Design an enzyme around this catalytic site. Sequence first.
Site, PDB file in Angstrom:
ATOM      1  N   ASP A  25      85.049   8.469  34.074  1.00  0.00           N
ATOM      2  CA  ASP A  25      86.181   8.196  34.915  1.00  0.00           C
ATOM      3  C   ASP A  25      86.643   6.714  34.846  1.00  0.00           C
ATOM      4  O   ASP A  25      86.128   5.832  35.557  1.00  0.00           O
ATOM      5  CB  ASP A  25      85.792   8.507  36.358  1.00  0.00           C
ATOM      6  CG  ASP A  25      86.941   8.494  37.268  1.00  0.00           C
ATOM      7  OD1 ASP A  25      88.088   8.097  36.891  1.00  0.00           O
ATOM      8  OD2 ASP A  25      86.744   8.786  38.485  1.00  0.00           O
ATOM      9  N   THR A  26      87.664   6.470  34.008  1.00  0.00           N
ATOM     10  CA  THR A  26      88.165   5.098  33.879  1.00  0.00           C
ATOM     11  C   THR A  26      88.853   4.591  35.141  1.00  0.00           C
ATOM     12  O   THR A  26      89.061   3.377  35.270  1.00  0.00           O
ATOM     13  CB  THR A  26      89.142   5.060  32.700  1.00  0.00           C
ATOM     14  OG1 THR A  26      90.256   5.962  32.903  1.00  0.00           O
ATOM     15  CG2 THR A  26      88.421   5.443  31.401  1.00  0.00           C
ATOM     16  N   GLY A  27      89.192   5.490  36.075  1.00  0.00           N
ATOM     17  CA  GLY A  27      89.764   5.082  37.353  1.00  0.00           C
ATOM     18  C   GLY A  27      88.717   4.790  38.412  1.00  0.00           C
ATOM     19  O   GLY A  27      89.135   4.542  39.580  1.00  0.00           O
TER      20      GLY A  27
END
Length: 99
Positions: A25-27
């Site tokens: 999850d890059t967020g």
Amino acid sequence: PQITLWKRPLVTIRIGGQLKEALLDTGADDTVIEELNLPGCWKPKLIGGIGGFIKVRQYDQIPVEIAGHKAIGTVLVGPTPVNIIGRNLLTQIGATLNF
């Protein structure tokens, strides 16, 4: 690997000697895993998402293997909807976004 995004980027991780599935999850700034026990002491923290804030247990310096790549870092444990690997560990395995 190279992972496309037509499906959720779910991968197998090893943590505390147990296998789990987690979303890359890059967020996410941090890594957040569903309730479990981890060896070591933890400290209470609050973190927020789209929906509001939750209380978690912060464990530091935890080994996590992500798709066969090693990381050692902070893992937050608590009532997250999905196990998520965040940027604190994605940087350790050299993950980038490319387009």
